[PDB]
Amino acid sequence: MLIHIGIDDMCTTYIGAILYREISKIAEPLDFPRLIRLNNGAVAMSFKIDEEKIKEVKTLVIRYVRELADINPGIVFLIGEVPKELEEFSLRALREHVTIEEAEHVARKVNAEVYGRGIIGGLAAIGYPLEKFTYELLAYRKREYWGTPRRVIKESVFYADKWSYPFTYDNVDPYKRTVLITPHGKDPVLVGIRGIDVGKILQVFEMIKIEEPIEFFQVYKTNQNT
Amino acid sequence: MLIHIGIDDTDSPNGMCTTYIGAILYREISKIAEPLDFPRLIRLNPNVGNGAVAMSFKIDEEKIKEVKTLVIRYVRELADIDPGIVFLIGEVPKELEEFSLRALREHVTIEEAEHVARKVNAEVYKFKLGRGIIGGLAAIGYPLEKFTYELLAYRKREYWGTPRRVIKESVFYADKWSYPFTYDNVDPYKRTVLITPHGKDPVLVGIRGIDVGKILQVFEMIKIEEPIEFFQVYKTNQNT
Amino acid sequence: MLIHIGIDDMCTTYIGAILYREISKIAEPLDFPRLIRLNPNVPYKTRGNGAVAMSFKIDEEKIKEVKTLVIRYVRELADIDHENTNPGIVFLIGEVPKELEEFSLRALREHVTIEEAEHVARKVNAEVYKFKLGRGIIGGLAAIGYPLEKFTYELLAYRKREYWGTPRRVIKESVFYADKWSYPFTYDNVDPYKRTVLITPHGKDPVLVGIRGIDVGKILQVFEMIKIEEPIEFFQVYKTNQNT
Amino acid sequence: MLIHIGIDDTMCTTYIGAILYREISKIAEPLDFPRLIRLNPGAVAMSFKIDEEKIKEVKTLVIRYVRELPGIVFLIGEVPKELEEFSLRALREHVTIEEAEHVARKVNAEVYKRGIIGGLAAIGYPLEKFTYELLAYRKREYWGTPRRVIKESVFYADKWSYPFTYDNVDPYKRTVLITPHGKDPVLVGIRGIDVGKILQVFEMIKIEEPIEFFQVYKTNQNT
Known part of the structure; x- marks a missing residue:
């Protein structure tokens, strides 16, 4: 059922x-x-x-x-x-x-x-x-940090992409298929990632420098585009 | 190299x-x-x-x-x-x-x-x-x-500019997204489509889509009445 | 339902x-x-x-x-x-x-x-x-x-009736295929495993040729590259408990 | 190059x-x-x-x-x-x-x-042939201390079981937990063949200590 x-x-x-x-x-x-x-x-x-x-x-x-x-x-x-x-x-x-x-x-x-x-x-x-959907992974803050300035550092790194193999290393991405979500204010979401490929979301996720403890995170499927 | x-x-x-x-x-x-x-x-x-x-x-x-x-x-x-x-x-x-x-x-x-x-x-x-x-x-x-797959079936030369022998058959396909839906359910988008050339074009028939599993479902279900030279899978910058 | x-x-x-x-x-x-x-x-024949x-x-x-x-x-x-039973x-x-x-x-x-x-x-x-x-x-x-x-894809191509028990008209010349994992490797490099295999029946079996593999894209690469000399009634993709 | x-x-x-x-x-x-x-x-x-x-x-x-x-x-x-x-x-x-x-x-x-x-x-x-292995790493200050992790027993989403009843049995465990002990700097780890299924499992792990970072590997090992 x-x-x-x-x-x-x-x-x-x-x-x-x-x-x-x-x-x-x-x-x-x-x-x-x-x-x-x-x-x-x-x-x-x-x-x-x-x-x-x-x-x-x-x-x-x-x-x-x-x-x-x-x-309500x-x-x-x-x-x-x-x-x-x-x-x-x-x-x-x-x-x-x-x-x-x-x-x-x-x-x-x-x-x-x-x-x-x-x-x-x-x-x-x-x-x-x-x-049609994209994945949206959302990490959540511990209540002690709600309303506290967000402690998360976006470091510029290269990612791995099959399509870029034939290109020179400075090849540029024509499309940003994966995007970071950076909330503000009392919002309990610490940070989130939207994209269509789970492996690529993992690549982004593992690389985010997170200086406060994630209470938990949840992957959603959404009718939103990246 | x-x-x-x-x-x-x-x-x-x-x-x-x-x-x-x-x-x-x-x-x-x-x-x-x-x-x-x-x-x-x-x-x-x-x-x-x-x-x-x-x-x-x-x-x-x-x-x-x-x-x-x-x-x-x-x-x-x-x-x-x-x-x-x-x-x-x-x-x-x-x-x-x-x-x-x-x-x-x-x-x-x-x-x-x-x-x-x-x-x-x-x-x-x-x-x-x-x-x-x-x-x-x-x-x-x-x-x-960004790309889509495009599978194209090619006609033997002897058939070029000959009346096309293909039957588009209306069938349901296997779609994961619709599992929780009732049998009679509106399909909001068509993400996989046929290319149907006419005249002397050597392409017998083609299929454009985003998923190879779905391309194969469509391809196997197409009734091809003439023997083809071969088919080729391309990736293309076009969309459906 | x-x-x-x-x-x-x-x-x-x-x-x-x-x-x-x-x-x-x-x-x-x-x-x-x-x-x-x-x-x-x-044998996956009968019975x-x-x-x-x-x-x-x-x-x-x-x-x-x-x-x-x-x-x-x-x-x-x-x-x-006319076999002639169900x-x-x-x-x-x-x-x-x-x-x-x-x-x-x-x-x-x-x-x-x-x-x-x-x-x-x-x-x-x-x-x-x-x-x-x-x-x-x-x-x-x-x-x-x-x-x-756990399963494996199996694409089977079927022969028209007129060809049954008629010498198979299908040829497999060797080509290289596109494999992600081989990117960092030199050109002259052999696969450690073959994950995609051909099925080549004999005799009056209605199957022309088949392909067993774990990946649809690779099945499609092998399939498009097969030289099929006789017309095929149709082909069908199955999922099977068998492996390569 | x-x-x-x-x-x-x-x-x-x-x-x-x-x-x-x-x-x-x-x-x-x-x-x-x-x-x-x-x-x-x-x-x-x-x-x-x-x-x-x-x-x-x-x-x-x-x-x-x-x-x-x-x-x-x-x-x-x-x-x-x-x-x-x-x-x-x-x-x-x-x-x-x-x-x-x-x-x-x-x-x-x-x-x-x-x-x-x-x-x-x-x-x-x-x-x-490879599997994915996701490894979470402890901060040094926590190495050699008792692990702060809770295993939550849950059902996961699987396509193949859609046509079976609720009480269906899972014939293979394709995704497995890695649980080290002692000084090992690995807090916990996951090995599977599907990154989707890795994520499902990862998100359900209850982590009660601040981790240094996590890394996804590909490995020759199986489950």
């Missing part, structure tokens, strides 16, 4: 990462969780589960979303395969403006449980067809 | 045989040298003269001359079925790579190409004062960072 | 490929079809040793259409080649249960009985279509249940 | 190797991840693209870092058949120090300062 969880409106990707990590203890993920940006960051994730575990998953989820409140937040649950009506809503939510009403109507029609405009994102995140 | 070969036939009103000839070269030279990658098919101007082919081989110093000779011979043989060759030895230098990128994004002159060719020591074999030198250099110098 | 089709008891891979191509017209395949060999010390399966996504409404088409297609193939067909609906997965693993590592196969088939509700009391049921169940965690 | 660097000695080898790869990456273009070559089913090597002008700069750099922190082997140009063959031979059998220096001189390798067998074999090894 498939079960999907969507959340929208600690930022969303932080909590969504907690959920993904916790639920992976009791259920088999289909894939990395997904970060769906409406132009917005809603998060969704899918697990293979048995009938008898729905309650446990539901309870866990609302348990964690609350502790990380114990310090739309949770959406769907059992089974994403039906065409929901996929169509997601594609629609990303092309144009959709109302909370349209969202309520679609959740009822597809039998989602909806536990703030958070429902629009929770729903769309669940239904988003990731035929 | 790297040797690169660029073929381009622009000041050849008509033509059509460029990728066909490039495929024969790739196939023949693989007999004696080690290819770096599939050959590359480069279009200079995406607004549709501007179609060139290149390829890169590893080889020992002793056999550079032999590669050049074989190439000249095959193009000669293949041409005399009723041209434009560039060679480059060693790594592709920054300037030739920069030239390639420039050619892909704006009009360049023959004088600019001669300049680059002399600076990087490319051999423009028996130049005939055409624009073909531009495509040959641009093809050699193109870095395959 | 998921439907799996298994085939057992030459024409097995041929028939399986046709099944895979035809059902793709109406249902969404999960992956390339799978070719499952039960014993490496034994019961070499089997084929495939998995499709289809809506509840069309499940019966799939089964019906599969049977018609196998019936016809029997009619044409190879065994097995259907399973829904996910493959742990019981069937484990049977498939046990069948690859040890001898199993027809009774053991009947036992799992009843337990997981596989439909063994028109059973003929053979060992084929084992191969069909095993093929359906096999988890493709 | 290609330059190759190989090190080996009679723990700190992959650590020093990682530092070299990281520093040289600042001035030269790596061909690939560094390679870890174990002669018994060890030695590190790496390959960078430079121009003639940078040879001394790289050599000088390497020599400086290894001493601040063992045989060093350098080579310029493509790896010749003779070195590759020695590399392959050094695995499947026993080779003498003398056999190694002979091979070194024949292929114009520079042997700075065993041990050389390992450096040479590392440089020359054809890794047509």
